Design a protein around this ligand. Sequence first.
Ligand SMILES: [Fe+3]
Ligand SMILES: [Fe+3]
Lengths: 199, 196
Amino acid sequence: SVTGPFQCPPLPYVKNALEPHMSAETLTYHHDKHHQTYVDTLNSIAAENSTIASKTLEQIIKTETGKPFNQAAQVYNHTFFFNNLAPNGGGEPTGKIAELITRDFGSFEKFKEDFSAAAVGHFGSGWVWLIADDGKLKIVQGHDAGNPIRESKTPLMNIDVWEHAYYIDYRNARAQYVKNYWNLVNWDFVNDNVAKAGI
Amino acid sequence: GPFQCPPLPYVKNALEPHMSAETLTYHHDKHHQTYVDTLNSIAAENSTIASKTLEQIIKTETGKPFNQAAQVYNHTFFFNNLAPNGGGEPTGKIAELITRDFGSFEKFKEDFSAAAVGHFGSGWVWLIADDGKLKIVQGHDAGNPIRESKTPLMNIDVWEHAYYIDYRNARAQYVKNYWNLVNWDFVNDNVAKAGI
Ligand SMILES: [Fe+3]
Ligand SMILES: [Fe+3]
């Protein structure tokens, strides 16, 4: 009844809050089944590995291998993903990311083209990330649980392209899912990530 | 052309309740067909790829062309690996080889299931003949043991699209129902052709 030590943070919005772009049924399975289960399994390992209980998700991402890495990475990836969406989100970015997007991709339209193409093209399960590398914006793909924190890097935005993220709502139409993700982006969260990094 | 998506070996609801008509429609009419289409589009621009068999591309190709050719084969194999009136205990040569190489069908079932439930991300679990020996091997993403000149006998798709409509996140329920569908005739045919 006291389970831990890792926890699955609650969604920052109610289940129907992202409709029609992402369904309540999707949020329920994706968060309450997939996300929560990754945390449960990690905890199972933590119970028998005091080294893995002593480490932050980020330290496990940087330092672990195999299943423990995959689990910690996935727990972080989903928390970041769900934080990265919002009921009053979407549309063109404002504030500092808007400036940096212009700086590094020329325009939001071009950034949107690049990021969508990466997300639509990723073969198999994975993630697409907007990262700040050494103060510079870059789009990187993470196959399976791949997370750029393992390298030097700072995540700013992501999209989950594992099939479970969209199959209930879009079946195999990943491109339609990616299109709809732009209506959901939480630019306030993205801008907080910018602010926290030096950039 | 040059590549084609073979029709399903049975009508869309033939596998219910284990696998739904809706799953067969999406998996075959959408995923499988689209792999073929995309490979065909690459073939129109790539005379080398257009010159090759699917198995030649699986053995020697790279990048996107490999992934597509392998997925075309993998899905044809998989849909052939299922049958209405399949399932149950194997008979014939495969039954003998499984007892030989795993001790019992039950032990093989355990091993194969654990591999399929265990596979992280998108992939395939194969039963293979390797110099006449049965082995279980995992193919991540489009991985196919023909690339290592091994002979495929059985497979299961553990890409989420294979089960999500019918089982959502419950992959282990999908894997258990798969045993009710296995087309042992197809598996024995593969055994016969391999000469093992
Ligand atoms: Fe996910
Ligand atoms: Fe498939």
